[PDB]
């Protein structure tokens, strides 16, 4: 650290190398912050978290209880220890409150004044953060597992909704729209993710043991479908082009967008080339996934090394994306961890779990 300073200062090394380089040192020093609390509201287990993209002060939670909470994670005090108080809530009484579990919640990117929720009540609701009232509501013939919007741009208004139906749903926030359908999955779509990198590319994962990358602008067909054997194994159809040996319930793009991470029920995590969908064959060892619903996990960003934090049991397994080494398993929670999200600003981490608690993980030293 003194070396970080004196280096940066005499301009020995580039200031933003030392910065990334420090940032990774921190992720490495990750541990449960027993000095920070998150105010308990959710009665059901926390299924999802999202930290506001720019400046990252406020964060959204959603429960099996169908509630959405909105926290301020910042600290006004003289002290190092504080609780993150919930600013707002979508509650039992709120006319527009979700009936069943809220599976995903995401800040409308590029506009803070709006956030989005999807539920098992077969809806996607578009919220308005100031007025805390509904803005748009969309309904589906089936339960909503995952939704997402493009972090990359304003070129389009599309949301991608994963449902129990084999058809992938594209709702258009500009007007009501949503006649847009991605076809070729044979089961529940348990996850959907837009490329951080490319504007119109989306990734979908289904219980059909398959993962597909689409250019949504195309009327028919996907770009690639992930084959875990890189096609070295000759299978009948209906067999070939599978990502995992079980439901694929996780999806994450590496920060640069050049690779895809999938988690299956086969207890495996695979890293794929996001372009050609080749298996990079990174190890990671066994990663326990038994979830019937979707599985939210996340990636570090802005550090030398890129890490992936995937819920593992009641812990959160930290791996290195490219190298494939398990760094540590962060242990604070007493029951199964449903999701964790990364605080890009300080290299902290927040986790949701079935203990109906949100834990803070900050780097030490």
């Amino acid at each position: 650290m003194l070396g970080f300073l004196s280096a940066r200062q005499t301009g020995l090394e580039d200031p933003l190398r030392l910065r990334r380089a420090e940032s990774t040192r921190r992720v490495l020093g990750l541990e449960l912050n027993k000095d920070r609390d998150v105010e308990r509201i959710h009665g059901g287990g926390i299924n999802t978290l999202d930290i506001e993209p720019v400046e990252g002060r406020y964060m959204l939670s959603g429960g099996s209880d169908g509630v959405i909470v909105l926290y301020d994670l910042e600290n006004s005090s003289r002290q190092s220890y504080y609780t993150c108080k919930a600013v707002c809530s979508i509650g039992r009484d709120h006319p527009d409150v979700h009936r069943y579990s809220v599976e995903t919640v995401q800040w409308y990117p590029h506009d803070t004044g709006m956030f989005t929720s999807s539920s098992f009540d077969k809806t996607l609701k578009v919220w308005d953060t100031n007025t805390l009232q509904t803005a748009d509501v969309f309904n589906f013939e089936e339960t909503v597992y995952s939704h997402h919007m493009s972090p990359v741009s304003t070129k389009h208004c599309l949301v991608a909704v994963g449902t129990r139906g084999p058809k992938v749903q594209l709702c258009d926030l500009k007007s009501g729209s949503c006649s847009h359908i991605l076809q070729g999955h044979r089961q529940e779509i348990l996850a959907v993710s837009w490329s951080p990198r490319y504007d119109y590319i989306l990734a979908t994962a289904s219980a059909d043991s398959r993962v597909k990358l689409w250019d949504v602008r195309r009327a028919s067909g996907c770009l690639i479908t992930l084959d875990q054997h890189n096609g070295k194994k000759s299978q009948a159809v209906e067999s070939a082009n599978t990502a995992h040996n079980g439901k694929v319930n996780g999806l994450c793009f590496t920060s640069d967008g050049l690779h895809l991470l999938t988690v299956g029920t086969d207890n495996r995590m695979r890293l794929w080339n996001s372009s050609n969908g080749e298996n990079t064959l990174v190890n990671y060892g066994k990663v326990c996934n038994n979830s019937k619903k979707g599985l939210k996990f996340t990636v570090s960003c802005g550090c030398s090394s890129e890490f992936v934090f995937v819920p593992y049991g009641s812990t959160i397994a930290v791996y290195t994306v490219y190298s494939g080494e398990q760094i540590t398993m962060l242990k604070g929670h007493y029951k199964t961890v449903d999701c964790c999200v990364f605080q890009s600003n300080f290299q902290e981490l927040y986790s949701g779990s079935r203990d109906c608690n949100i834990l803070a993980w900050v780097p030490s030293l």
């Binding site: 003194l2 300073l5 002060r57 006004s76 640069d256 030293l365």
Partner: protein
């Protein structure tokens, strides 16, 4: 105040790159130097470097290379910004008008990506088939030179190898082939790919990758014969052509890591190498034709080399970021023919107003390691040399008018050793002549025109009075016993010479020299002055004297020689020159010792009473004074090693430095061809000329041969505190003697508290005048000096140097121990007053309202200084990530944090505690922090950005700091300090940077800000920027997480550029606005008054 002006006071001095080719003409040898934002072109000539053009780029130059595509007359320039603007430049000169055209330009930024660890790499195919760029981990951008691509449209190729150290295109390949070193777990290796422009993908390399040295950092491609690549590791140097493997491990290079290289011979038979320790090296390749073996020889020692290129005939240019850049000739050993000043990384600086004048002067901690120094930056008046004629030996100068009818000075008399010489000086031409009545065979103490159209020449021998209508000689006065004359002083009528302690008073009458008063002095006369004040006669009632022995300035009643006043100056240093003069109305006595000390007194033409004594030290050498009238007012010139002009403004003395080297003697000379000019003479030459109206910065260097870190100024002690760090290696010892080891007296920390190359840390006490190192305190093994403060605390009258430290152990990532230490320097002894133990690193300290404010790791705390001489903790504020930076105004504290950006924290005297006032809820990594006024807060981003925060104006959310400014500086700011280099805009802040650039920030009224803002925009349209880059882009706040248009900042560099633009181009800009022409000229001119 929410509206801010930023202007560059000193351009960046550090060299991030240099390259050599034929840019300006195919038959010219060019040297190009990129200094951050700055591009300098030169032609290598018979003798030296002819400068040709210097241009600013809107951006930090990442990559500079010249290359020649088939069908171009001369080389083209390819530049990449760090904001990733790419361009291809041509050099076009029409007559004496000279322009750099943008032949192609585009921005190659990718929306997202992982910036590679070893940084941006530009490379160009030897056949100019493409430009390769490695910007981000995972990709290789290709800028095709195949077709005509005016937009520089580029494309990525996926690179399976995610860690690439260095890469180069190889020579001699049927298709562009890159060779590169990359790291995977199994080690570092060198691999090759062909680059298909059709497939837009890589193809298999020509030769299979091979394992390389664990530390192999650097790839050189070898030219057409031998082919292949040479790979520099810290231990070994290997060669791979793909058929043959050659490796050598010289012992001589193990000491350092080799950071740069240059091919000397085109056939690649010889390469220059350079390392972090300053060593220049020569790499040689012995030789149907192929490579036999490699050999390394140590050529010498140059500035620590950022980059280096050989020019021709044994001269080598050294670019250096860490210290002075060089032009050096090779021999066994290396000699620097030329030295280019670089304020290296300015790690710290402080503004001192010495002399208690109106004007500021900057003293910096500059460079590092071998290159470390202090630099003293001050403004000053230059002079114009019309004529310089070689006359070693000059002991004096006098102007004389020979023709009594003529009102112009026709005669320059130069005293020498046993002789005097006389200059005829007709017009612009000066030639040696004789003068009748004047002896040449004695040394001349004084001469000039006197009463009744006569001349007088005083010498060691006699005072000789001369009639100038006939010439010849009228009278002469010799000492009665024929003893030698000691000192001379003469005005138009009266004369006083002193022989030893003896004194003679003489008058000048027609064809006569009348002796009147006589006396013998207590001690030997040192210097005298009779220049009459207030006139009313032309006769001076008073005599100005100073003596050896007792060291006294005395004023005496002239007719009698009775003593009016005797002031005791004190000290072993004897008075060199004494002068009486009047500034404004008021009368001063000026007496300058031989050490540079100049005392100045209030003088009474009646009592002869010297009152209100004051002293300033300008120079270390004996200072002699001469009076010279400049237009309106009379000024005193001071000849010394720091030559100075002294005058009055607002009835308070002003000392202007002069940008000359050293001046032994001077006299004002106005001839028919040299009007109202000055005669200066140094040890070698007698130069003639005038004072330059415009002030330019003058810079002095005090080389430390180790690393300055903090610096601060103790006035009462008349010295600077400085924290330095020298490296020693394994008990330990240095590679070289540095300032810490040169100390006249030195101490070592005795602390009992806490109980292969290591930093050793010193507190240096440095004299504010000689700049010698008076004392060096060395800290504990593994102690680090971090922060340093000069102040007095509590009710205690003593001024102290207070130094925070940390214990740095190898096993730990952040220090769990450190200490604050109070030192006092008085009576030339460095005293340790007190220690205070702390639980970690003390990153910053500031004197707060008679209290000490320090930050330790995550904690900002306030100390009170006890009547027991100790530090008692008053209050802690624990809410921080890392508190690296402290600034204060009143009860307000500004705390710079590593990531959390900035916080306005306050002290409630009532609760004896801290309360957060407001915070910046934008996360930022801070370099520096400054408080502009109670409301606005200035800050420096890790990414070379500036911003401004402001206390808002309803709810409890007033704890939110609004961002009222954002600006991309392009420089990394280490230090902010209030002050100005001079003497429309409120306030002045100066900043030091890593590349050596010095800036200034100041505030504008909204009315102004808007005017300039429009002016910026119209200026922008009219000015043709080099790479066709957008100015507004250039200045846009930019980081990983944000990119935004600069607001609340006016770019002074851009605005001051309006004075150089074409007369019409001016009227173009003006147009409509919000005002006409000369109006803006007036404005922009005033704006330059600020630096």
């Amino acid at each position: 105040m929410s509206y801010n002006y930023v202007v560059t006071a000193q351009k960046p001095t550090a060299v991030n790159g240099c390259v050599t080719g034929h840019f300006t003409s195919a038959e010219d040898l060019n040297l190009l130097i990129a200094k951050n934002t700055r591009l300098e072109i030169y032609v290598v000539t018979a003798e030296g470097l002819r400068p040709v053009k210097e241009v600013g780029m809107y951006g930090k130059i990442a990559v500079m290379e010249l290359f020649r595509p088939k069908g171009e007359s001369k080389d083209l320039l390819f530049i990449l910004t760090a904001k990733y603007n790419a361009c291809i430049l041509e050099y076009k000169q029409s007559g004496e008008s000279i322009d750099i055209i943008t032949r192609a330009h585009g921005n190659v930024q990718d929306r997202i990506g992982r910036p590679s660890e070893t940084g941006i790499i530009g490379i160009i195919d030897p056949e100019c088939r493409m430009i390769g760029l490695r910007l981000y981990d995972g990709l290789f951008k290709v800028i095709p030179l195949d077709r005509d691509n005016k937009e520089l449209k580029a494309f990525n190729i996926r690179l399976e190898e995610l860690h690439v150290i260095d890469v180069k295109f190889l020579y001699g390949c049927q298709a562009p082939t890159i060779c590169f070193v990359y790291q995977d777990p199994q080690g570092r290796h060198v691999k090759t790919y062909e680059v298909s422009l059709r497939e837009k993908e890589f193809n298999k390399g020509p030769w299979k990758q091979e394992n390389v040295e664990a530390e192999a950092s650097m790839v050189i491609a070898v030219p057409e014969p031998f082919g292949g690549a040479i790979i520099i590791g810290q231990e070994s140097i290997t060669y791979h052509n793909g058929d043959k493997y050659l490796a050598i491990a010289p012992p001589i290079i193990k000491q350092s890591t080799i950071v740069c290289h240059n091919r000397v011979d085109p056939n690649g038979s010889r390469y220059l190498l350079g390392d972090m320790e300053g060593r220049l090296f020569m790499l040689l390749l012995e030789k149907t034709v192929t490579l036999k073996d490699l050999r390394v020889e140590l050529l010498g020692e140059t500035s620590i080399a950022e980059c280096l290129t050989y020019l021709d005939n044994g001269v080598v240019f050294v670019g250096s970021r860490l210290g002075d850049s060089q032009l050096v000739k090779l021999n066994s050993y290396v000699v620097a023919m030329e030295t280019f000043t670089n304020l290296g990384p300015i790690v710290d600086m402080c503004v001192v107003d010495l002399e208690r004048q109106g004007q500021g002067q900057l003293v910096t901690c500059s460079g590092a390691f071998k290159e470390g120094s202090l630099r003293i930056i001050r403004n000053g008046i230059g002079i114009h040399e019309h004529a310089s004629i070689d006359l070693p030996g000059i002991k004096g100068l006098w102007p004389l008018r020979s023709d009594p009818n003529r009102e112009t000075d026709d005669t320059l008399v130069l005293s020498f050793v046993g002789q005097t010489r006389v200059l005829m000086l007709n017009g612009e031409e000066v030639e040696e002549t004789e003068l009748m009545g004047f002896v040449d065979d004695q040394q001349t103490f004084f001469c000039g025109n006197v009463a009744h159209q006569q001349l007088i020449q005083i010498t060691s021998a006699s005072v000789r009075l001369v009639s100038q209508e006939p010439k010849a000689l009228v009278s002469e006065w010799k000492e009665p016993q024929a003893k030698n004359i000691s000192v001379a002083s003469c005005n138009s009528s009266q004369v006083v010479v002193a022989v030893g302690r003896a004194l003679y008073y003489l008058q000048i009458h027609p064809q006569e020299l009348r002796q009147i008063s006589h006396t013998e002095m207590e001690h030997e006369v040192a210097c005298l002055d009779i220049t009459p004040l207030g006139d009313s006669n032309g006769l001076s009632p008073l005599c100005a004297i100073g003596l050896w022995t007792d060291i006294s300035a005395r004023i005496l009643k002239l007719p009698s020689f009775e003593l009016l006043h005797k002031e005791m100056l004190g000290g072993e240093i004897i008075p060199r020159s004494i002068l009486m003069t009047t500034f404004e109305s008021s009368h001063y006595l000026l007496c300058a010792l031989g050490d540079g000390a100049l005392f100045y007194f209030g003088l009474n033409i009646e009592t002869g009473l010297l009152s209100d004594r004051k002293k300033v030290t300008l120079g270390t050498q004996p200072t002699v004074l001469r009076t010279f009238r400049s237009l309106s007012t009379t000024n005193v010139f001071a000849c010394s090693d720091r030559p100075t002009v002294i005058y009055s403004s607002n009835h308070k003395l002003v000392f202007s430095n002069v940008n000359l080297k050293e001046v032994n003697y001077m006299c004002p000379l106005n001839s028919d061809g040299y009007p109202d000019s000055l005669a200066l003479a140094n040890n070698s030459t007698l130069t003639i000329g005038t004072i330059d109206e415009i002030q330019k910065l003058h810079i002095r260097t005090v080389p430390l041969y180790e690393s300055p870190r903090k610096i601060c100024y103790q006035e009462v002690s008349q010295c600077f505190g400085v924290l330095s760090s020298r490296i020693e290696v394994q008990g330990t010892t240095a590679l070289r003697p540095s300032a810490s080891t040169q100390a006249l007296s030195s101490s070592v920390s005795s602390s009992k508290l806490f109980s292969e190359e290591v930093e050793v840390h010193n507190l240096l006490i440095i004299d504010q005048h000689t700049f010698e190192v008076l004392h060096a305190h060395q800290f504990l093994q593994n102690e680090y000096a971090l922060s340093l403060v000069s102040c007095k605390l509590g009710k205690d009258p003593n001024t102290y140097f207070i130094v925070g430290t940390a214990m740095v152990y190898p096993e730990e990532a952040e220090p769990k121990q450190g200490r604050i230490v109070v030192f006092q320097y008085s009576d030339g002894k460095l005293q340790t007053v007190a220690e205070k133990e702390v639980k970690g690193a003390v990153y910053s300290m500031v004197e707060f309202n008679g209290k000490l404010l320090a930050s330790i790791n995550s904690t900002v705390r306030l100390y009170e200084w006890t009547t027991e001489k100790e530090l008692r903790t008053e209050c802690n504020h624990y809410n921080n990530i890392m508190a690296l930076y402290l600034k204060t105004k009143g009860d307000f504290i500004l705390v710079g944090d590593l990531m959390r950006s900035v916080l306005l924290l306050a002290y409630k005297p009532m609760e004896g505690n801290f309360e957060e006032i407001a915070r910046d809820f934008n996360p930022n990594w801070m370099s520096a922090v400054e408080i502009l006024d109670d409301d606005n807060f200035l800050g420096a981003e890790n990414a070379f950005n500036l911003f401004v925060c402001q206390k808002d104006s309803t709810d409890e959310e007033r704890q939110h700091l609004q961002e009222v400014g954002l600006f991309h500086l392009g420089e990394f700011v280490n230090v902010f300090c209030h002050g100005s280099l001079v003497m429309p805009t409120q306030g002045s802040v100066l900043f030091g940077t890593v590349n050596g650039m010095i800036g200034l920030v100041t505030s504008l009224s909204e009315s102004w800000y808007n005017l300039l803002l429009d002016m910026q925009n119209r200026l922008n349209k009219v000015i043709k920027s080099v790479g066709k880059i957008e100015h507004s882009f250039w200045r846009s706040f930019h980081t990983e997480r944000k990119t935004e248009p600069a607001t609340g900042f006016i770019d002074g560099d851009l605005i001051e550029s309006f004075l150089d633009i074409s007369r019409p181009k001016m009227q173009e800009v003006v147009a409509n606005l919000q005002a006409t022409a000369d109006d803006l000229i007036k404005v922009v001119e005033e704006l330059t008054r600020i630096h």
